[PDB]
Amino acid sequence: TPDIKLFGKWSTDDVQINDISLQDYIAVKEKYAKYLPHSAGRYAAKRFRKAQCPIVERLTNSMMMHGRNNGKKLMTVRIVKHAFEIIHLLTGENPLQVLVNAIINSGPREDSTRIGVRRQAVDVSPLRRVNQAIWLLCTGAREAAFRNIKTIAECLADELINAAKGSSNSYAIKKKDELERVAKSNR
Amino acid sequence: MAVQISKKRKFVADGIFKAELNEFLTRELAEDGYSGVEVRVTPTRTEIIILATRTQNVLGEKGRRIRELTAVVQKRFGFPEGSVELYAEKVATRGLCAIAQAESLRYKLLGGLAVRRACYGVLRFIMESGAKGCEVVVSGKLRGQRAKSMKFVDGLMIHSGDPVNYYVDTAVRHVLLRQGVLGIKVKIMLPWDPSGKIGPKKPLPDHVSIVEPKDEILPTTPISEQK
Amino acid sequence: VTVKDVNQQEFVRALAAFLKKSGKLKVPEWVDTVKLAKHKELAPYDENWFYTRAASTARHLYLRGGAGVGSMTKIYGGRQRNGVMPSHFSRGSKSVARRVLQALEGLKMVEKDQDWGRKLTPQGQRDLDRIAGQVAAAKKK
Amino acid sequence: MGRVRTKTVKKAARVIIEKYYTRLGNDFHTNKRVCEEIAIIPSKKLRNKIAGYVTHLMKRIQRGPVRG
Amino acid sequence: AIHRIRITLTSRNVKSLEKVCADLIRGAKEKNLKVKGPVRMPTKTLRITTRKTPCGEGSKTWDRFQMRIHKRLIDLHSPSEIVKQITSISIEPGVEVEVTIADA
Amino acid sequence: PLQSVQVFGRKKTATAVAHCKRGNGLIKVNGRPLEMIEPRTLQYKLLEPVLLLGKERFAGVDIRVRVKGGGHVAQIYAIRQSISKALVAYYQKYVDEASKKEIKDILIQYDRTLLVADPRRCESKKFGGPGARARYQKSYR
RNA sequence: AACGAGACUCUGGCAUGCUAACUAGUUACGCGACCCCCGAGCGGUCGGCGUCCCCCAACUUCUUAGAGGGACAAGUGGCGUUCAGCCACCCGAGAUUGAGCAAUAACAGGUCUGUGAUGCCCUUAGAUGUCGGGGCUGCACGCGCGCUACACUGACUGGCUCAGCGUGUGCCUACCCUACGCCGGCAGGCGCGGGUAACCCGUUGAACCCCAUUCGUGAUGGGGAUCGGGGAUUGCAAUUAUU
Ligand SMILES: [Mg+2]
Ligand SMILES: [Mg+2]
Ligand SMILES: [Mg+2]
Ligand SMILES: [Mg+2]
Ligand SMILES: [Mg+2]
Ligand SMILES: [Mg+2]
Ligand SMILES: [Mg+2]
Ligand SMILES: [Mg+2]
Ligand SMILES: [Mg+2]
Ligand SMILES: [Mg+2]
Ligand SMILES: [Mg+2]
Ligand SMILES: [Mg+2]
Ligand SMILES: [Mg+2]
Ligand SMILES: [Mg+2]
Ligand SMILES: [Mg+2]
Ligand SMILES: [Mg+2]
């Protein structure tokens, strides 16, 4: 620990990416362990510099969207913080493993391109699998807590939980299944 | 005031003064080859210098014109009597001052001459006096009722970059005739006088130049001669 | 301990009770019908707002001498929403800040400075340091 | 990108080499000073570009001879 | 006797201003006048941004003119006669030179 | 015998100067302790160097930091870079060389911008748009 | 061979190397003083806080601004007719900051309402060259650039804590930026000072952001149109509401 940063409280060892493709594109442990999801981060400089970014800072960045949320990142770090504690209560598992499983369960691996309403099926790159997973997971929390009495932190944890426990009750998994079904039709 | 004007207003006011004096002396000494003023505020006095090509015409008979000029410059700008002091001077190599050639061509055209003949005469003069290049444009109703433009270029001429703030002299002059105005534009390139003041120093940026030495001998024998 | 070594949001909270524990620091009469700045919409929630603002003004005078009313009203100035037109920055209320500084002088806590302005007395630095020590020893910082 | 030198740089470097062939070496920070002292380049960026092409030419003249 | 005197120069051209200030420093130091080095105050930048066209037609382009005012000051401890001796020589360009008799 | 060193850090027009001097602990920025710098959401950000080199390296020095410029987040990075740039400079003048190149590598492996500032600055606005790259809305018909 | 491109100029990034500074500072202690034990201790000595006061202290790290330096596809590995060059990497403040300037030829583009630039035509004393009043703002409707919102990633009320580019007393022309004391809920008023400015406003206590209260999915405490009544200031004059 004196040389192992957790998150303040969440240990980042004993977290297993159980995919062979999506690893090397999910920067959780052993070199990307950091105290906070907030760095200067000149990650948008070259083509693939983005995969070296910690995944929690890839979610913190994507969560601040739709107009009156742009640049409000210190508001977007406390959201992830309050959500990880909700996740640890509702389940009991290390809240980073739930995030990794949710990212794995919601990135589509087949998709379709408009060509020549003609579409043709193609297979998704791993980086695009991670990007689509993050975007889908954030949009679900956004649309779930837009006029509810529930808070953006309860619904983000709801989304992550229903995604890691593949249930089709999360917005991200309904959307994945549609893209892969529409792509299977156009096969 | 008890506390005088601030530095910003002071410098802006100096510039406006110089511009108005230059306009005034332009509108008057045109027929005498006026080519610029140099306000040199010296201890105890405000000295103004007028370069020109015909200095006798500037001062006149015993200096009546020059004294009238001192008089008006002292009346209009509010100077204490005895301060404004004015000098005339002759410009060397008049063929390289654009304003002089522009006004010369304007009066040569105002007196009746084939516009091509006049433009080619001034081109000849400007290039003969020593100049990397010149360019004279005349725009207006030349030979008809529809306007046109006639451009006479010669030698080298640059249009782009910083080296154009020096290395070129530009002059634009209107000339009114029996039917509408004509526009005269003269541009000249100064021929890089090193350490001199007929052109600029500091040669063109893309002008790397190499020197070649000698006195190196290949025949050699290891002799150590003493002194 | 010093005043700078402790969380200031609890320091203001303790000093407000200190001020509203003595009976001194006579408040104005218009305390219940005043908006506190041009750019506000309602009266302050907290009924005993004058003691909190006196504590705030005192802790502000501890940190910079010679403040005077025209700066207290800049220290409490914020944003004004002009309805349909864009928002701008706005000053606090001179009457409130002036009455607060006059009520602090009525406690020997502050004095009018040598250059024009207001400043803490030696007796005010002591009352702020004692409350700082009390706060530090309370929360075991 | 760019990094394609211009004829004003290449001709200057070729002349500098063809006259002072024996003063020029293989390192850049010395060729820079040599070309600074033997010629008159009216800029510092141009000086660096000329001295950087001189080095790339010298690295070739040590092999088979160039044709300019 | 001795006096604390302040010279101030200001102009729109750096080369000639620095040349004048340096020659003044030298020509005053050679007589052991205990000069105080030049103090470079911030450079002022007047800016005027105008429309490029008369008449209001065309694409909406603009021109950005600007003037720059450089300022320096020198401090000397010397009799005023020597100050007027040294300050009134070799003033080539349109730089200003102001002398004040007591500033310290 | 005096023994001290002053260094600086920058991030987006926000300078932070740190003065390191032989003493005991006491990393103090602007007179207040390091645990009470305004945004406490980034509390773990200006604690990283000491949480990286251990409390024992900051045991013979007394660092005092002063900050001025930028905003609430550009100053956290200034402080966090300045104290590291200070401990690395104090270890290379009054201690051995390997003793400084060890902590230099410990710091520069976990994160750059702890020793090397980054050159990103705001870009200028151009006429014809609300910012540097955006343009106003085009309108045919 | 010439122009344009490039070169060029301004700008942003780096120098614990140089030059040198009460109209900028740092550190030191000379200090002196306030305060609290907050530490050993006693409370003193040692310390801790200070935009509290001084130095004919030492210095230039931060500030200022001048001179030089520094980057060249220079080093290393691939791909290249082994040429011009391209990709990757080490070292590095940086390996692709941003603007200014810009050619020949042309358009029945815009400007006679910028001009004591201007040709021709018109008017010239019952004037098309001056004062008072009204208009340029009128409203069934069509269109363009935009501001504020549709709320809980929020509104409200308190507390806390950070900028940079600028401008500032006007000649005809009469008006500038404001400190601090008092008075008033507020807009605002009275009284006395500083500044022609790195000197005074000013250490420019900016907003979003940060930390705690109240609200609770209801066109609601979201939103702030429309309209009634009252109070100030600028001005010679406010109605068709100037602010
Ligand atoms: Mg060219
Ligand atoms: Mg160019
Ligand atoms: Mg913007
Ligand atoms: Mg050819
Ligand atoms: Mg190679
Ligand atoms: Mg490196
Ligand atoms: Mg460029
Ligand atoms: Mg063109
Ligand atoms: Mg016109
Ligand atoms: Mg006409
Ligand atoms: Mg008009
Ligand atoms: Mg009239
Ligand atoms: Mg009228
Ligand atoms: Mg109109
Ligand atoms: Mg438009
Ligand atoms: Mg608020």
List keywords for this structure.
part of a larger assembly, 6 chains, A: 187 residues, mainly alpha, E: 104 residues, alpha+beta, Alpha-Beta Plaits, 4-stranded antiparallel sheet, 2 helices, 45% strand, elongated
What does the secondary structure layout of this molecule look like, with pairings?
This is part of a larger assembly, with chains A (187 residues), B (227 residues), C (141 residues), D (68 residues), E (104 residues) and F (141 residues).
Chain B: H1 7-28, E1 37-42, E2 45-52, H2 55-59, H3 64-76, E3 84-90, H4 98-110, H5 115-128, E4 133-140, E5 148-155, E6 168-176, E7 181-189, E8 209-210
Parallel strand pairs in B: 2-3
Antiparallel strand pairs in B: 1-2, 4-5, 4-7, 6-7
Chain D: H1 7-19, H2 28-38, E1 39-40, H3 45-61
Chain F: E1 4-10, E2 14-21, E3 28-29, E4 32-33, H1 48-53, E5 64-69, H2 74-90, H3 98-110
Parallel strand pairs in F: 3-5
Antiparallel strand pairs in F: 1-2, 2-5, 3-4
Bound molecules: magnesium ion (16 copies).
Chain C binds one RNA strand of 243 nucleotides through helix 1, helix 2, helix 3, helix 4 and helix 5.
Characterize the overall form of chain A: globular
What's the CATH architecture name of chain F? 2-Layer Sandwich
Number of strands of chain F: 5
**Do you know the CATH topology of chain F?**
Ribosomal Protein S5, domain 2
Secondary structure category of chain A: mainly alpha
Helix run count of chain A:
6
Number of strands of chain A: 2
List the helices and strands of chain A in order. HHHEEHHH
Q: What is the overall silhouette of chain F?
A: elongated
Helix content of chain A: 40-55%
Characterize the main sheet of chain F: 5 strands, mixed
Biggest sheet of chain A, in brief? 2 strands, antiparallel
Question: What gyration radius of chain A follows from the Cα positions, in whole Å?
Answer: 17 Å
Q: Over the alpha carbons, how many angstroms does the gyration radius of chain F reach?
A: 19 Å
Widest sheet of chain F: strand order? 1-2-5-3-4
Bound molecules: magnesium ion
The sequence of SSEs of chain F as H and E is EEEEHEHH
Q: Of all protein chain pairs, which has the greatest interface, and how many residues does each chain bring to it?
A: A-F, 13 and 16 residues
Total number of distinct structural domains of chain A: 1
Keywords (chain A): Ribonucleoprotein, Ribosomal protein
GO molecular function, one term (chain A): mRNA binding
Subunit structure (chain A): Component of the small ribosomal subunit. Part of the small subunit (SSU) processome, composed of more than 70 proteins and the RNA chaperone small nucleolar RNA (snoRNA) U3.
InterPro entries (chain A): Ribosomal_uS7, Ribosomal_uS7_CS, Ribosomal_uS7_dom, Ribosomal_uS7_dom_sf, Ribosomal_uS7_euk/arc
